[PDB]
Design a protein around this ligand. Structure first.
Ligand code: ATP
Ligand code: XAN
Ligand code: CA
Ligand code: ZN
Lengths: 362, 96, 184, 145, 48
């Protein structure tokens, strides 16, 4: 019985692991089909139904089946990733921690910096019974004991590694052994190291690709509730294609300089708002009919919002939207104000942000 | 151009030693060659510490090398600084 | 200093090793204090010179204003500098820095929350997964599947993986809640 | 073929005018500057279409009252009622505006979605006008160079 | 001179190994130290 169930389970897990990429591809295809179906979408007449209009008629069942299939294949893609790439990440982490423990004693002599979340999380795995499960050297604890036992305390390092003293001598020598039976489940439950899979699921959650696939999961399951959440799956082509990833990473590349440049752009516009709020307020009436003035620079928050929006995205500066200053004693001062706005805000720091991003891409 | 000049300054710092001016690759032939050369052999702050040590030390207790450096320092002769040479290059055939 | 000078000037004689590996500790203690340079000797050769660097002077060097002055001078000489004028600007900066460190001794007379919240969420959300898997219903599931059933059989691990993903979602929500707690 | 069709309609002789662009060396360089970065150019305009489609989805879901485009209020044009029409209005007029979609879309003052629309359109101006358009232009001009 | 098994060569030619090789090759060339190059290569060898 149990032999058969384990064999079928492992065969199907291998099926998913083998077919990870093909399903990764068909999921994107279904995501495209769903968006194409959604493209012919209506609103009907307060009665507001988001109604799917069809010249043929049978699109709505097709969209329902496509959504269900997308969710099923997405779950299967997560299973495939978990059975295909997760062992490699676990092996890399479990080799890194083993070599840090052996060569440097990062959990014995010198404790982690307490800011390395990976280090504090791997503090939990050093005492797990089922250690190098994926790593090939299943004697790293035996070696670190010999290396650091006599100076840092035989028993203290032993209980730090969570290793029993009884097995040491008769492991090399002759002793009794314990076989296993598949049907016997108490032994299986004891051998399932709560701390080890504890740490393993911690590592898997910290992994970025699994987070991406689980976000994809979530977007699909929300797409069931609202059909429009399937449009976020459309960005997966930008993740698949190389140059699209280059374009997307061109923004994060110069992140610090970009953030500081937009902050300086906000600061300069805030100074302009302060100047306008102090002096140039009569010019900020924005009402077509003079009976009810809009008067949008009366409040500093509103005037700064009007210099943030509309002002920056104008193509000629704030003076395009602000009324003409002819016939006023502040005519020359407003000319200088707005010309400096156009030069410093539109010609400059905007070309600078654009240049930063495009140069990062290049 | 200003940003590129800053990057070029950092690049030259990482690719050539300040005093001797020899390329980093010549030392990096051996592992950590440039790091060793710029940290111990030709450290920038080491010359500052040596000048301070000369200033604090009595001239009567100066060694031959110390007196030489002191003399050409007050004569404003900076030839004692290595110029495109190092200990490794000077005794390269003898060292290895 | 004598041992280091001998080791450097004679890098192959094995007999001096015995002394070196007998005296790591003295050399290791004196390593920060020992200063090493190379100069144009009177015999027109490179000569390594060893001197004493005081710990107080090293701290004065490591003080922040000296670091900023060093950064500024390093940028200036590299951006504009002549081969003859380089070594002169360096010594002028050396004298200015010596004065600055002398003044510094006179004047100076004698993330974690975000890490911990994420760790707590990782601990007691996967602990929640362990609690809801601790029911130990495998025997009941084998009573259910008394002869093979492919559908009942696959739905078990399907629900298990679905629950793993839902625990991931609960973890993401917990991290968002913890970050909101930290900020406000 | 263009000549024999020019007999039927005299205006088909204007396509023969492009033969000077085939004769001259630098004109061929300019023409081939487009095909040079063909893959990157196609993918960039595809990404530009995708981003504008997301903006259309957002506007169609929430920002629809602002899309009345009728001079006389008696007969509203209401051009974001249909998703195809609203995406067409974000493809055309929106991209070739010089300041973003907010130039043609009416002012949002006095509305509870005022800040949300500000963020919507400012992000449109940055991501669509300042970015990916300078990118397409740079790809073509850099290929020519 | 040594023996390369055909099964091992097929495992090398499998697609995921190819993708990992491409990623590692890009990483070491874009960022890499002369001492650290040969260490990253052997770490990638063990992972592969
Ligand atoms: N003569 C030199 N002295 C010191 N460092 C040098 C020298 N020539 C080149 N360098 C290089 O400069 C760097 C160290 O000096 P620098 O001040 O430029 O950098 P840093 O690491 O930021 O310094 P700091 O110790 O002030 O933090 C190293 O990369 C080193 O290889
Ligand atoms: O002895 C070993 N050394 C290794 O590097 C290794 N990698 C996998 N398996 C291994 N065994
Ligand atoms: Ca004397
Ligand atoms: Zn040097």
């Amino acid at each position: 019985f149990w032999k058969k169930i384990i064999a079928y389970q492992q065969k199907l897990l291998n099926y998913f692991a083998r077919n990870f990429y093909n399903m990764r591809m068909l999921a994107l295809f279904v995501a495209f089909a769903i968006n194409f179906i959604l493209l012919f979408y209506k609103v009907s007449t307060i009665a507001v139904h988001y109604v799917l209009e069809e010249s043929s008629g049978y699109m709505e069942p097709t969209l329902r089946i496509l959504a269900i299939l997308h969710t099923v294949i997405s779950f299967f893609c997560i299973i495939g990733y978990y059975c295909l790439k997760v062992p490699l990440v676990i092996f890399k982490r479990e080799k890194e921690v083993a070599r840090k423990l052996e060569f440097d004693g990062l959990y014995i002599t010198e404790q982690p910096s307490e800011d390395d979340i990976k280090g504090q999380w791997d503090r939990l795995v050093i005492n797990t019974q089922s250690f190098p499960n994926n790593y090939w050297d299943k004697f790293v604890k035996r070696k670190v004991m010999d290396k650091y036992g006599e100076f840092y305390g035989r028993d203290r390092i032993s209980e730090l590694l969570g290793m029993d003293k009884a097995a040491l001598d008769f492991s090399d020598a002759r002793e009794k052994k314990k076989p296993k039976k598949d049907s016997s489940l108490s032994a299986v439950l004891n051998s399932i190291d709560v701390k080890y899979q504890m740490w393993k699921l911690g590592v898997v959650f910290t992994d970025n690709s699994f987070l991406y696939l689980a976000w994809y999961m979530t977007m699909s399951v929300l797409g069931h509730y609202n059909n429009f959440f399937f449009a976020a799956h459309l960005l997966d082509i930008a993740m698949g294609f190389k140059t699209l990833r280059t374009i997307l990473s061109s923004v994060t590349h110069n992140g610090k300089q970009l953030v500081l440049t937009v902050g300086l752009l906000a600061v300069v516009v805030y100074l302009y708002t302060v100047v306008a709020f102090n002096f140039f307020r009569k010019f900020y009436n924005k009402s077509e009919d003079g009976d009810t003035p809009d008067m949008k620079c009366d409040d500093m928050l509103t005037c700064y919002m009007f210099h943030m929006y509309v002002g920056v995205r104008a193509g000629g500066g704030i003076g395009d939207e602000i009324e003409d200053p002819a016939g006023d004693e502040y005519e020359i001062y407003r000319i200088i104000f707005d010309i400096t706005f156009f030069f410093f805000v539109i010609v400059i720091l905007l070309a600078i942000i654009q240049g930063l991003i495009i140069d990062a891409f290049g | 151009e200003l940003r590129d000049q800053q990057e070029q300054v950092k690049e030259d710092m990482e690719t050539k030693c300040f005093i001797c001016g020899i390329g980093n690759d010549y030392f990096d032939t051996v592992p950590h060659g440039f790091e060793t050369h710029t940290l111990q052999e030709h450290n920038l702050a080491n010359y500052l510490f040596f000048l301070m040590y000369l200033i604090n030390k009595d001239e009567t207790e100066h060694t031959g090398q110390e007196s030489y450096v002191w003399k050409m320092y007050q004569e404003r002769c900076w030839e004692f600084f290595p110029a495109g040479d190092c200990f490794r290059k000077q005794y390269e055939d003898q060292l290895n | 200093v004598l041992l280091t000078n001998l080791s450097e000037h004679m890098p192959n004689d094995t007999r001096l090793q015995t002394f070196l590996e007998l005296a790591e500790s003295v050399l290791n203690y004196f390593q920060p204090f020992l200063g090493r340079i190379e100069i144009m000797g009177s015999a027109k050769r490179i000569e390594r010179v060893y001197f004493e660097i005081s710990e107080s002077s090293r701290t004065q060097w490591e003080k922040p204003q000296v670091k900023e002055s060093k950064r500024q001078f390093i940028f200036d000489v590299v951006n504009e500098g002549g081969e003859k004028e380089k070594m002169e600007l360096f010594v002028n900066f050396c004298e200015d820095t010596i004065f600055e460190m002398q003044l510094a001794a006179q004047i100076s007379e004698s993330s974690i929350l975000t890490v911990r919240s994420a760790l707590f969420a990782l601990r007691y959300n996967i602990l929640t997964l362990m609690r809801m898997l601790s029911l130990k219903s495998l025997k009941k599931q084998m009573k259910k599947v008394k002869k093979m059933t492919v559908k009942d059989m696959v739905t078990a691990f399907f629900s298990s993986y679905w629950s793993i993903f839902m625990t991931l979602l609960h973890f993401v929500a917990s991290v968002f809640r913890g970050f909101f707690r930290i900020i406000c």
